[PDB]
């Protein structure tokens, strides 16, 4: 799913979304990471 969290950029999400969320990736959308 979309966030609130900021990014500018998609590898900033993945590990964060790795860390958070156990997600396999994340990536930047609209300046807002989505988790997948």
Do not use: A
């Amino acid at each position: 799913r979309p966030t609130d969290i900021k990014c500018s950029e998609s590898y900033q999400c993945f590990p964060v979304c790795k860390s958070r969320f156990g997600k396999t990736n994340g990536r930047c959308v609209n300046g807002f990471c989505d988790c997948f």
